[PDB]
Design an enzyme around this catalytic site. Structure first.
Site, PDB file in Angstrom:
ATOM      1  N   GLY A  80       6.979   4.974   4.147  1.00 22.98           N
ATOM      2  CA  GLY A  80       7.289   6.307   4.623  1.00 22.98           C
ATOM      3  C   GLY A  80       8.093   6.266   5.901  1.00 22.98           C
ATOM      4  N   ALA A  81       7.922   7.287   6.735  1.00 24.80           N
ATOM      5  CA  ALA A  81       8.638   7.380   8.004  1.00 24.80           C
ATOM      6  C   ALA A  81       7.952   6.606   9.128  1.00 24.80           C
ATOM      7  CB  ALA A  81       8.823   8.835   8.402  1.00 24.80           C
ATOM      8  N   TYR A  82       6.762   6.085   8.854  1.00 24.33           N
ATOM      9  CA  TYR A  82       6.022   5.318   9.839  1.00 24.33           C
ATOM     10  C   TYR A  82       6.390   3.850   9.728  1.00 24.33           C
ATOM     11  CZ  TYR A  82       3.424   6.603   5.638  1.00 24.33           C
ATOM     12  OH  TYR A  82       3.072   6.964   4.360  1.00 24.33           O
ATOM     13  N   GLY A  83       6.595   3.401   8.498  1.00 25.03           N
ATOM     14  CA  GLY A  83       6.946   2.023   8.220  1.00 25.03           C
ATOM     15  C   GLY A  83       6.362   1.609   6.887  1.00 25.03           C
ATOM     16  N   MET A  84       6.102   0.317   6.721  1.00 25.13           N
ATOM     17  CA  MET A  84       5.526  -0.200   5.485  1.00 25.13           C
ATOM     18  C   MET A  84       4.116  -0.687   5.767  1.00 25.13           C
ATOM     19  SD  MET A  84       6.564  -3.030   2.775  1.00 25.13           S
ATOM     20  CE  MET A  84       8.199  -2.926   3.487  1.00 25.13           C
ATOM     21  N   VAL A  85       3.157  -0.323   4.921  1.00 19.33           N
ATOM     22  CA  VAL A  85       1.780  -0.712   5.158  1.00 19.33           C
ATOM     23  C   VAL A  85       1.267  -1.537   4.016  1.00 19.33           C
ATOM     24  CG1 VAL A  85      -0.544   0.075   5.757  1.00 19.33           C
ATOM     25  CG2 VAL A  85       1.468   1.264   6.620  1.00 19.33           C
ATOM     26  N   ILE A 137       0.836  -1.193   0.000  1.00 16.91           N
ATOM     27  CA  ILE A 137       0.000   0.000   0.000  1.00 16.91           C
ATOM     28  C   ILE A 137       0.873   1.245   0.000  1.00 16.91           C
ATOM     29  CG2 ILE A 137      -1.663   1.378   1.300  1.00 16.91           C
ATOM     30  CD1 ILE A 137      -2.845  -1.236   2.335  1.00 16.91           C
ATOM     31  N   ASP A 174      -0.008  16.201  14.367  1.00 20.36           N
ATOM     32  CA  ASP A 174       0.351  15.789  13.014  1.00 20.36           C
ATOM     33  C   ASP A 174      -0.846  15.637  12.081  1.00 20.36           C
ATOM     34  OD1 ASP A 174       2.387  15.458  11.232  1.00 20.36           O
ATOM     35  OD2 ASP A 174       2.669  13.322  11.628  1.00 20.36           O
TER      36      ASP A 174
END
Ligand SMILES: CN1CCN(c2ccc(Nc3nccc(-c4cc5c([nH]4)CCNC5=O)n3)cc2)CC1
Length: 340
Positions: free
Chosen positions: A24-29, A21, A139
Site C-alpha cells: 500500500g502507501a505505507y510500504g510492503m509488509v 502480507i 487515520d
C-alpha cells in the site's frame, strides 16, 4: 537477499522465511521468522527517500512508536537498514506479528456484542494513551487496527499523526485533506485542519457503527458527498451548532440545504445494544465541542465491565511540539542508529 513478489527484502540473516502480507502507501509488509527470539514477526519495508512527504511520514512513525509503549499500540522490535547513509535506500520496521486486522475481519466475520465491546474498549484505552501524549492519530480506520487469535487489538500507522494544536485548527471551506474520506469528521470539510482530539473520536464512532452492521456508515465518493451522508443520518445541524461555524462559505452552504431529519440509531441498528447506540450517538456528534472525550467514552455504561482507571495508563512524557528531503534522511538515520 530474499525477494518477495518482485521486490528485495534485505532483513537477513536474523529474519528468514518471508511471506507476503500486503502492500500500500505505507510500504510492503511481510511475516518473517526471528531466528533470535525464535518467533514469527512482521516486517514493514519502506522506501521514502525519493519523496519528502514519504520521508517525514517515515520520521513521524519512528519517533512516536519509539517513545510510545502501550499494550494497545503496535511497537517496534527492531529496525533494519544500511550501516551508512550513502547506502541507505530502504527502511525495515520489525513489529509484532498479528493474525489479521479489523478491515479483513469485518469483510467476512459477523462480530458478537461481547467482541464489539472488547474491541471498542481496547481502541479507547489505547487512544487515551495517544491523546495523553498530546498526539492525534488522524487515520483511525479498520485497516489500522490489528488483531491476534486471542482478540488482542492494536493501533497502527502513525505517519499522519500530529501534536494537537487547537489554536491553529480553523481553515476555509473545503480545504484539502488526506485522512480517509469515510472516517473524516464533518468539520474537516467545513472549517477544520484536524488538529483536535475530537476528530479521532469521530473516526472511532465510524468504526463502531461499522462493527454493528459490517457496512460503512458514511461511504462518501468524494470530498463533499462525505458531508452529505453525515447529514442524511445526523440531520440538519441546529442553530447553536451553526452559530459555532463563523466561516461564511461553510455556514452558507449548510443554510442552502433543505431540512433533513435525524435517522434514529435504533432504526439503522435495530439489533444493537441500547448502550452501544447511546455511546455511538455521543461519538458521532456534529459539533466537535459537544463530542464525547476519550476518558468519558471509557467511563460509558457500555464499557463498565472493562473500565478501570488504574489499568488505563497515560504517557510519561507527552510531545512538546510538532526541510529538504536530504535533511529528513539524516534524522531517520540518527533515529534508527539505536538498532545497529
Ligand atoms: C487481506 N490481508 C490479510 C492479512 N491481514 C493482516 C494484517 C496484519 C497482520 N499483522 C501485522 N503485524 C504488524 C504490523 C502490521 C501492519 C502495520 C501496518 C499495516 N499492517 C497496514 C497499515 N499500515 C501499517 O503501518 N500488521 C497480518 C495480516 C491484512 C489483510
Amino acid at each position: 537477499p530474499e525477494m518477495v513478489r518482485g521486490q528485495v527484502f534485505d532483513v537477513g540473516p536474523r529474519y528468514t522465511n518471508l511471506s507476503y502480507i500486503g502492500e500500500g502507501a505505507y510500504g510492503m509488509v511481510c511475516s518473517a521468522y526471528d531466528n533470535l527470539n525464535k518467533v514469527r514477526v512482521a516486517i514493514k519495508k519502506i522506501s521514502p527517500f525519493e519523496h519528502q512527504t514519504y520521508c517525514q511520514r517515515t520520521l513521524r512513525e519512528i519517533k512516536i512508536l519509539l517513545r510510545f509503549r502501550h499494550e494497545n499500540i503496535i511497537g517496534i522490535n527492531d529496525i533494519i537498514r544500511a550501516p551508512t547513509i550513502e547506502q541507505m535506500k530502504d527502511v525495515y520496521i520489525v513489529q509484532d506479528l498479528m493474525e489479521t486486522d479489523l478491515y479483513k475481519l469485518l469483510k467476512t466475520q459477523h462480530l458478537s456484542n461481547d467482541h464489539i465491546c472488547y474491541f471498542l474498549y481496547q481502541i479507547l484505552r489505547g487512544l487515551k494513551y495517544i491523546h495523553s501524549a498530546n498526539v492525534l492519530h488522524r487515520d483511525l480506520k479498520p485497516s489500522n487496527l490489528l488483531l491476534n487469535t486471542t482478540c488482542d487489538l492494536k493501533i497502527c500507522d502513525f505517519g499522519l499523526a500530529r501534536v494537537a494544536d487547537p489554536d491553529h485548527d480553523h481553515t476555509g471551506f473545503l480545504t484539502e485533506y488526506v485522512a480517509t474520506r469515510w472516517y473524516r469528521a464533518p468539520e474537516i470539510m467545513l472549517n477544520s485542519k484536524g488538529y483536535t482530539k475530537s476528530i479521532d473520536i469521530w473516526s472511532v464512532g465510524c468504526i463502531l457503527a461499522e462493527m454493528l452492521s459490517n457496512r460503512p456508515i458514511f461511504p462518501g465518493k468524494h470530498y463533499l458527498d462525505q458531508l452529505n451522508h453525515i447529514l442524511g443520518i445526523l440531520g440538519s445541524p441546529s442553530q447553536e451548532d451553526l452559530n459555532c461555524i463563523i466561516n461564511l462559505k461553510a455556514r452558507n452552504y449548510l443554510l442552502s440545504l433543505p431540512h433533513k431529519n435525524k435517522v434514529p440509531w435504533n432504526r439503522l441498528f435495530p439489533n444493537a445494544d441500547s448502550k452501544a447506540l447511546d455511546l455511538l450517538d455521543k461519538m458521532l456528534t456534529f459539533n466537535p465541542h459537544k463530542r464525547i472525550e476519550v476518558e468519558q467514552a471509557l467511563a460509558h455504561p457500555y464499557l463498565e465491565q472493562y473500565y478501570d482507571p488504574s489499568d488505563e495508563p497515560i504517557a510519561e512524557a507527552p510531545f512538546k511540539f510538532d526541510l529538504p528531503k536530504e535533511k529528513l534522511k539524516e534524522l531517520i538515520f540518527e533515529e534508527t542508529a539505536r538498532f545497529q
